[PDB]
Amino acid sequence: MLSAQERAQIAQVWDLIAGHEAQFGAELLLRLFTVYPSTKVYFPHLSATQLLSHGQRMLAAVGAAVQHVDNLRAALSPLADLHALVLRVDPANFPLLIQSFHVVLASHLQDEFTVQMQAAWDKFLTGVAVVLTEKYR
Amino acid sequence: MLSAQERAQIAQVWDLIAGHEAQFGAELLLRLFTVYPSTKVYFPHLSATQLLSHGQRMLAAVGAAVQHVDNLRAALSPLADLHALVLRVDPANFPLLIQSFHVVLASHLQDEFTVQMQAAWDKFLTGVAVVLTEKYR
Ligand code: HEM
Ligand code: HEM
């Protein structure tokens, strides 16, 4: 449950990502793989231009989720099935990705990525992660 | 157990912090308080110049720990007693601080804070946190 101010804040973060999905997503994956090498097993194909492609897909889906905070479970249902049932992504990986995403955004946006924006963004992404992991057995 | 390359990497990170302990530490606390408001209960006195003072103390201790990775338990013993026994800081707060610290460093250092440096820094700070929490009952 995001407040109106929090929804405005995550829209502001997204406006700073739009157009950079591939580059920011590739850097997110690189940071995740280096700081948490256990995550590399999920991406044997990516383990450099293929990084840009997957990064683009991933962050484009994040942008779509911003437009659907009120019905995230319905809108993300295919992606939830994919991560929980088909890919079998251990839910513990999702906080590692979210923390890594904050670092990449801070590196590019510096003080434009304010602590208020980070709090809202973290709440939003934690909710996305719940949807993408709750079907995991 | 940090490798020689990892020790070189954390020395490089510290060289980029030195002189900015107060400012970076204050921003670390502000980010921690905003993204994780549950942490504010530990700092009723700080909850703005007092932020600079505490930030300075905290990050100066980090710098001292860099010089003592081989005998962290002995060198940090007073600080371990303080956090675990006197302040009773719940160990779950330490990952929140470490993640917040990466974000603050990225915001200021941008791509100079490389993913290799972050991996080494994270390993180092996770070890500091183990020392500062293992006495907690
Ligand atoms: C907010 C969190 C996440 C979002 C929005 C997201 C989004 C996506 C999307 C849209 C795809 C489709 C790629 C395609 O069909 O080409 C995908 C695939 C994939 N995701 Fe995620 N993902 C997230 C978290 C994770 C995490 C934490 C992991 C593992 C650590 C992961 C591992 C994978 C893998 C292995 C694939 C398949 C890649 C491929 O087949 O090329 N994802 N993800
Ligand atoms: C790498 C991790 C940490 C380091 C190196 C560190 C370092 C320090 C130092 C050097 C002091 C002494 C301040 C003084 O005597 O004036 C201190 C005090 C304190 N620390 Fe930490 N700290 C760490 C983590 C934490 C965390 C995670 C919390 C709580 C969320 C915390 C809460 C406190 C509090 C409440 C004080 C007392 C402040 C005061 O009395 O003014 N510390 N810390």
Short mmCIF file of C-alpha atoms and ligand atoms in Angstrom, two decimals:
data_model
loop_
_atom_site.label_atom_id
_atom_site.label_comp_id
_atom_site.label_asym_id
_atom_site.label_seq_id
_atom_site.Cartn_x
_atom_site.Cartn_y
_atom_site.Cartn_z
CA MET A 1 0.00 0.00 0.00
CA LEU A 2 1.72 3.13 -1.35
CA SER A 3 0.57 6.62 -0.39
CA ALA A 4 -0.07 9.37 -2.94
CA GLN A 5 3.22 11.05 -2.02
CA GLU A 6 5.06 7.72 -2.32
CA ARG A 7 3.47 7.12 -5.74
CA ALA A 8 4.64 10.57 -6.83
CA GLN A 9 8.13 9.76 -5.56
CA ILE A 10 8.39 6.47 -7.47
CA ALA A 11 7.15 8.21 -10.62
CA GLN A 12 9.99 10.71 -10.17
CA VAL A 13 12.51 7.88 -9.85
CA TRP A 14 11.14 6.19 -12.95
CA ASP A 15 11.37 9.44 -14.95
CA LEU A 16 15.11 9.40 -14.20
CA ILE A 17 15.46 5.77 -15.36
CA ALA A 18 13.44 6.00 -18.57
CA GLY A 19 15.72 5.71 -21.60
CA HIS A 20 18.49 4.06 -19.56
CA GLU A 21 16.88 0.67 -18.91
CA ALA A 22 19.53 -1.27 -20.83
CA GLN A 23 22.57 0.52 -19.39
CA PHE A 24 21.31 0.69 -15.80
CA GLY A 25 20.04 -2.89 -15.96
CA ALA A 26 23.36 -4.18 -17.27
CA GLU A 27 25.20 -2.36 -14.48
CA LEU A 28 22.74 -3.74 -11.94
CA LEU A 29 23.48 -7.29 -13.09
CA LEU A 30 27.24 -6.69 -13.09
CA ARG A 31 27.09 -5.33 -9.55
CA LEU A 32 24.90 -8.21 -8.42
CA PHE A 33 27.26 -10.80 -9.97
CA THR A 34 30.37 -9.25 -8.42
CA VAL A 35 29.14 -8.48 -4.90
CA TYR A 36 26.99 -11.66 -4.70
CA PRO A 37 28.67 -14.27 -6.95
CA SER A 38 26.06 -16.88 -5.89
CA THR A 39 23.64 -15.09 -8.20
CA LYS A 40 25.69 -15.92 -11.30
CA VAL A 41 24.22 -19.45 -11.47
CA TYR A 42 20.93 -17.97 -12.67
CA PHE A 43 22.62 -16.40 -15.72
CA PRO A 44 25.00 -18.93 -17.30
CA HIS A 45 24.40 -17.27 -20.66
CA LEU A 46 25.44 -13.84 -19.32
CA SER A 47 28.28 -15.08 -17.09
CA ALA A 48 28.38 -8.41 -22.47
CA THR A 49 25.84 -7.12 -24.99
CA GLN A 50 23.51 -9.85 -23.73
CA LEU A 51 23.73 -8.05 -20.38
CA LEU A 52 22.27 -4.95 -22.03
CA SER A 53 19.38 -6.97 -23.44
CA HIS A 54 18.46 -8.67 -20.20
CA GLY A 55 18.92 -5.45 -18.24
CA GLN A 56 16.55 -3.72 -20.65
CA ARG A 57 13.84 -6.39 -20.22
CA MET A 58 14.12 -6.38 -16.47
CA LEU A 59 13.96 -2.61 -15.99
CA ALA A 60 11.21 -2.19 -18.60
CA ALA A 61 9.14 -4.59 -16.49
CA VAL A 62 9.89 -2.43 -13.45
CA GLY A 63 8.57 0.60 -15.31
CA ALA A 64 5.41 -1.28 -16.26
CA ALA A 65 4.92 -2.24 -12.62
CA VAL A 66 5.03 1.44 -11.63
CA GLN A 67 1.86 1.93 -13.67
CA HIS A 68 0.15 -1.01 -11.92
CA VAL A 69 0.79 -0.64 -8.17
CA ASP A 70 -2.96 -1.00 -7.53
CA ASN A 71 -3.17 -4.43 -9.21
CA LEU A 72 0.41 -5.73 -9.17
CA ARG A 73 -0.57 -9.38 -8.68
CA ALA A 74 -2.75 -9.46 -11.79
CA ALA A 75 -0.36 -7.41 -13.93
CA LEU A 76 2.74 -9.37 -12.89
CA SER A 77 1.14 -12.83 -12.82
CA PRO A 78 3.09 -14.15 -15.87
CA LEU A 79 6.34 -12.81 -14.46
CA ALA A 80 5.54 -14.29 -11.04
CA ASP A 81 4.96 -17.70 -12.62
CA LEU A 82 8.22 -17.34 -14.56
CA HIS A 83 10.43 -16.47 -11.59
CA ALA A 84 8.84 -18.69 -8.95
CA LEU A 85 7.80 -21.78 -10.94
CA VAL A 86 9.88 -21.91 -14.14
CA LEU A 87 13.18 -20.27 -13.17
CA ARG A 88 12.91 -21.27 -9.50
CA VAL A 89 14.63 -18.09 -8.32
CA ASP A 90 15.27 -18.44 -4.60
CA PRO A 91 13.41 -15.53 -2.93
CA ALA A 92 16.56 -14.55 -1.01
CA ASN A 93 18.01 -13.21 -4.26
CA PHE A 94 15.44 -10.45 -4.55
CA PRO A 95 16.72 -8.24 -1.68
CA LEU A 96 20.22 -8.56 -3.16
CA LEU A 97 18.92 -7.22 -6.47
CA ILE A 98 16.96 -4.39 -4.82
CA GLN A 99 19.97 -3.25 -2.76
CA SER A 100 22.16 -3.44 -5.87
CA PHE A 101 19.61 -1.35 -7.79
CA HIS A 102 19.78 1.47 -5.21
CA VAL A 103 23.58 1.56 -5.58
CA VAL A 104 23.46 1.78 -9.37
CA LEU A 105 20.84 4.54 -9.24
CA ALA A 106 22.88 6.49 -6.67
CA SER A 107 26.02 6.23 -8.79
CA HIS A 108 24.26 7.83 -11.77
CA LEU A 109 21.75 10.16 -10.14
CA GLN A 110 23.80 11.22 -7.06
CA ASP A 111 21.80 13.57 -4.82
CA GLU A 112 18.88 13.66 -7.26
CA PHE A 113 18.07 10.18 -5.87
CA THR A 114 16.96 11.59 -2.53
CA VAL A 115 16.49 9.59 0.63
CA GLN A 116 12.72 10.17 0.39
CA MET A 117 12.78 8.79 -3.16
CA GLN A 118 14.85 5.80 -2.03
CA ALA A 119 12.41 4.96 0.77
CA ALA A 120 9.47 4.98 -1.64
CA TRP A 121 11.39 3.07 -4.29
CA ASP A 122 12.47 0.45 -1.76
CA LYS A 123 8.88 -0.03 -0.57
CA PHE A 124 7.68 -0.36 -4.16
CA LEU A 125 10.36 -2.85 -5.20
CA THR A 126 9.91 -4.88 -2.01
CA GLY A 127 6.25 -5.24 -2.98
CA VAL A 128 7.14 -6.27 -6.53
CA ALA A 129 9.47 -8.88 -5.03
CA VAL A 130 6.71 -10.26 -2.82
CA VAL A 131 4.54 -10.77 -5.90
CA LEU A 132 7.39 -12.42 -7.84
CA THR A 133 8.32 -14.82 -5.00
CA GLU A 134 5.12 -15.74 -3.18
CA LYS A 135 4.40 -18.67 -5.53
CA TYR A 136 7.82 -20.22 -4.83
CA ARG A 137 7.67 -23.66 -3.23
CA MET B 1 39.76 -13.59 5.69
CA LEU B 2 40.58 -10.88 3.13
CA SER B 3 42.99 -11.51 0.25
CA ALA B 4 45.86 -9.18 -0.61
CA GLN B 5 43.91 -7.80 -3.58
CA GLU B 6 40.83 -7.30 -1.38
CA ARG B 7 42.94 -5.49 1.23
CA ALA B 8 44.28 -3.22 -1.51
CA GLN B 9 40.72 -2.57 -2.68
CA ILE B 10 39.45 -1.59 0.78
CA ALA B 11 42.46 0.70 1.23
CA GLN B 12 41.45 2.39 -2.03
CA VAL B 13 37.90 2.86 -0.77
CA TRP B 14 39.16 4.29 2.51
CA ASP B 15 41.42 6.76 0.68
CA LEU B 16 38.27 8.13 -0.96
CA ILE B 17 36.47 8.47 2.40
CA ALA B 18 39.29 10.07 4.39
CA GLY B 19 38.48 13.69 5.18
CA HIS B 20 34.75 13.15 4.61
CA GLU B 21 33.94 11.01 7.67
CA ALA B 22 31.56 13.57 9.18
CA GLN B 23 29.67 14.41 5.97
CA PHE B 24 29.45 10.84 4.66
CA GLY B 25 28.56 9.51 8.10
CA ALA B 26 25.80 12.07 8.56
CA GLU B 27 24.37 11.17 5.16
CA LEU B 28 24.60 7.48 6.02
CA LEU B 29 22.55 8.04 9.17
CA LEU B 30 19.99 10.18 7.34
CA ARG B 31 19.57 7.50 4.68
CA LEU B 32 19.30 4.77 7.30
CA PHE B 33 16.67 6.73 9.27
CA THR B 34 14.55 7.47 6.20
CA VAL B 35 14.65 4.11 4.41
CA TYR B 36 14.53 2.10 7.69
CA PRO B 37 12.66 4.26 10.24
CA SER B 38 12.88 1.43 12.83
CA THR B 39 16.52 2.42 13.27
CA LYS B 40 15.61 5.86 14.62
CA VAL B 41 14.92 4.45 18.11
CA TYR B 42 18.66 4.00 18.62
CA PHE B 43 19.29 7.73 18.11
CA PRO B 44 16.68 9.73 20.05
CA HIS B 45 19.24 12.53 20.42
CA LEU B 46 19.78 12.74 16.64
CA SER B 47 16.15 12.16 15.62
CA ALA B 48 21.56 18.07 12.58
CA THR B 49 25.08 19.05 13.57
CA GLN B 50 24.96 16.18 16.06
CA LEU B 51 24.56 13.96 13.00
CA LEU B 52 27.93 15.21 11.74
CA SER B 53 29.57 14.38 15.07
CA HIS B 54 28.20 10.86 15.31
CA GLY B 55 28.87 10.22 11.63
CA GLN B 56 32.48 11.29 12.15
CA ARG B 57 32.97 8.91 15.12
CA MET B 58 31.42 6.00 13.30
CA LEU B 59 33.39 6.35 10.07
CA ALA B 60 36.65 7.11 11.89
CA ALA B 61 36.19 3.76 13.64
CA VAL B 62 35.69 2.14 10.22
CA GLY B 63 38.99 3.62 9.07
CA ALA B 64 40.74 2.30 12.16
CA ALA B 65 39.30 -1.15 11.47
CA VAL B 66 40.83 -1.09 7.98
CA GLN B 67 44.25 -1.01 9.64
CA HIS B 68 43.37 -4.00 11.86
CA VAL B 69 41.73 -6.63 9.63
CA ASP B 70 44.18 -9.23 10.97
CA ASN B 71 43.11 -8.73 14.61
CA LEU B 72 39.67 -7.14 14.37
CA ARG B 73 38.29 -8.85 17.48
CA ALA B 74 41.03 -7.50 19.74
CA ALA B 75 41.06 -4.03 18.18
CA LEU B 76 37.26 -3.65 18.20
CA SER B 77 36.62 -5.32 21.56
CA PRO B 78 35.51 -2.08 23.33
CA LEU B 79 33.24 -1.20 20.43
CA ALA B 80 31.83 -4.74 20.38
CA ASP B 81 31.03 -4.51 24.09
CA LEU B 82 29.41 -1.11 23.50
CA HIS B 83 27.12 -2.16 20.66
CA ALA B 84 26.21 -5.65 21.85
CA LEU B 85 26.07 -5.26 25.64
CA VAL B 86 25.55 -1.56 26.46
CA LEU B 87 23.55 -0.24 23.50
CA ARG B 88 21.90 -3.60 22.75
CA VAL B 89 21.86 -2.94 19.00
CA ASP B 90 19.86 -5.72 17.38
CA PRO B 91 22.24 -7.44 14.91
CA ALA B 92 19.66 -7.12 12.11
CA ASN B 93 20.43 -3.40 11.97
CA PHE B 94 23.98 -3.92 10.77
CA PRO B 95 23.15 -5.10 7.20
CA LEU B 96 20.82 -2.09 6.89
CA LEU B 97 23.71 0.21 7.75
CA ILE B 98 26.14 -1.56 5.39
CA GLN B 99 23.71 -1.39 2.45
CA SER B 100 23.04 2.28 3.23
CA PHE B 101 26.79 2.94 3.31
CA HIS B 102 27.25 1.55 -0.22
CA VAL B 103 24.52 3.89 -1.49
CA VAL B 104 26.08 6.98 0.09
CA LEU B 105 29.51 6.08 -1.29
CA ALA B 106 28.07 5.48 -4.77
CA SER B 107 26.28 8.84 -4.73
CA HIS B 108 29.55 10.69 -4.05
CA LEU B 109 32.13 8.52 -5.79
CA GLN B 110 30.02 7.33 -8.79
CA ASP B 111 32.01 4.95 -11.01
CA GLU B 112 35.18 5.41 -8.93
CA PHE B 113 33.44 3.08 -6.43
CA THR B 114 33.85 0.07 -8.70
CA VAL B 115 32.01 -3.21 -8.32
CA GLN B 116 35.29 -4.89 -7.34
CA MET B 117 35.78 -2.27 -4.63
CA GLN B 118 32.19 -2.74 -3.44
CA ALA B 119 32.62 -6.51 -3.14
CA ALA B 120 35.74 -6.11 -1.02
CA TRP B 121 34.20 -3.33 1.05
CA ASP B 122 31.07 -5.40 1.66
CA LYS B 123 33.13 -8.40 2.80
CA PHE B 124 35.17 -6.17 5.12
CA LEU B 125 32.16 -4.44 6.67
CA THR B 126 30.28 -7.73 7.05
CA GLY B 127 33.24 -8.97 9.08
CA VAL B 128 33.27 -5.81 11.22
CA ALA B 129 29.56 -6.37 11.83
CA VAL B 130 30.14 -9.95 12.95
CA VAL B 131 32.64 -8.70 15.53
CA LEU B 132 30.27 -5.96 16.74
CA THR B 133 27.26 -8.32 17.09
CA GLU B 134 28.57 -11.70 18.16
CA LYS B 135 28.40 -10.81 21.87
CA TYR B 136 24.70 -9.90 21.60
CA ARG B 137 22.41 -12.05 23.74
C1 HEM C 1 12.20 -6.69 -9.52
C2 HEM C 1 12.74 -7.89 -9.79
C3 HEM C 1 12.78 -8.56 -11.20
C4 HEM C 1 12.16 -8.23 -12.35
C5 HEM C 1 11.20 -7.06 -12.63
C6 HEM C 1 12.55 -9.18 -13.36
C7 HEM C 1 12.12 -9.16 -14.67
C8 HEM C 1 12.43 -10.15 -15.58
C9 HEM C 1 11.93 -10.20 -16.94
C10 HEM C 1 10.98 -9.16 -17.54
C11 HEM C 1 12.40 -11.29 -17.54
C12 HEM C 1 12.10 -11.73 -19.00
C13 HEM C 1 13.34 -11.91 -19.86
C14 HEM C 1 12.97 -12.50 -21.20
O1 HEM C 1 11.88 -13.12 -21.32
O2 HEM C 1 13.80 -12.35 -22.14
C15 HEM C 1 13.25 -11.96 -16.59
C16 HEM C 1 13.94 -13.13 -16.82
C17 HEM C 1 14.83 -13.70 -15.95
N1 HEM C 1 15.07 -13.28 -14.66
FE1 HEM C 1 14.18 -11.73 -13.68
N2 HEM C 1 13.42 -10.10 -12.79
C18 HEM C 1 13.58 -9.73 -11.47
C19 HEM C 1 14.36 -10.39 -10.55
C20 HEM C 1 15.19 -11.46 -10.82
C21 HEM C 1 16.15 -12.03 -9.91
C22 HEM C 1 16.35 -11.54 -8.45
C23 HEM C 1 16.76 -13.06 -10.53
C24 HEM C 1 17.88 -14.01 -10.03
C25 HEM C 1 18.83 -13.63 -9.16
C26 HEM C 1 16.21 -13.14 -11.87
C27 HEM C 1 16.57 -14.04 -12.85
C28 HEM C 1 16.04 -14.11 -14.12
C29 HEM C 1 16.42 -15.06 -15.13
C30 HEM C 1 17.47 -16.15 -14.91
C31 HEM C 1 15.70 -14.83 -16.23
C32 HEM C 1 15.77 -15.60 -17.57
C33 HEM C 1 16.74 -14.88 -18.51
C34 HEM C 1 16.69 -15.42 -19.91
O3 HEM C 1 15.99 -16.44 -20.13
O4 HEM C 1 17.33 -14.84 -20.81
N3 HEM C 1 15.26 -12.15 -12.01
N4 HEM C 1 13.25 -11.25 -15.41
C1 HEM C 2 30.24 -0.76 11.11
C2 HEM C 2 29.28 -0.52 12.01
C3 HEM C 2 29.40 0.50 13.18
C4 HEM C 2 30.46 1.18 13.65
C5 HEM C 2 31.92 1.16 13.17
C6 HEM C 2 30.02 2.01 14.75
C7 HEM C 2 30.82 2.85 15.48
C8 HEM C 2 30.39 3.55 16.59
C9 HEM C 2 31.23 4.38 17.42
C10 HEM C 2 32.73 4.59 17.18
C11 HEM C 2 30.50 4.89 18.41
C12 HEM C 2 31.02 5.82 19.55
C13 HEM C 2 30.28 7.14 19.64
C14 HEM C 2 30.72 7.91 20.86
O1 HEM C 2 31.27 7.29 21.81
O2 HEM C 2 30.51 9.15 20.87
C15 HEM C 2 29.15 4.41 18.24
C16 HEM C 2 28.08 4.71 19.05
C17 HEM C 2 26.78 4.36 18.80
N1 HEM C 2 26.37 3.52 17.78
FE1 HEM C 2 27.52 2.58 16.40
N2 HEM C 2 28.66 1.81 14.93
C18 HEM C 2 28.26 0.89 13.97
C19 HEM C 2 26.98 0.41 13.82
C20 HEM C 2 25.87 0.85 14.52
C21 HEM C 2 24.50 0.48 14.23
C22 HEM C 2 24.09 -0.48 13.10
C23 HEM C 2 23.71 1.10 15.13
C24 HEM C 2 22.16 1.08 15.29
C25 HEM C 2 21.33 0.95 14.24
C26 HEM C 2 24.57 1.88 16.00
C27 HEM C 2 24.16 2.67 17.05
C28 HEM C 2 24.99 3.41 17.87
C29 HEM C 2 24.55 4.23 18.97
C30 HEM C 2 23.08 4.37 19.39
C31 HEM C 2 25.61 4.80 19.53
C32 HEM C 2 25.63 5.76 20.75
C33 HEM C 2 25.61 7.20 20.23
C34 HEM C 2 25.86 8.20 21.34
O3 HEM C 2 25.92 7.79 22.52
O4 HEM C 2 26.00 9.41 21.03
N3 HEM C 2 25.87 1.71 15.60
N4 HEM C 2 29.11 3.61 17.11
#
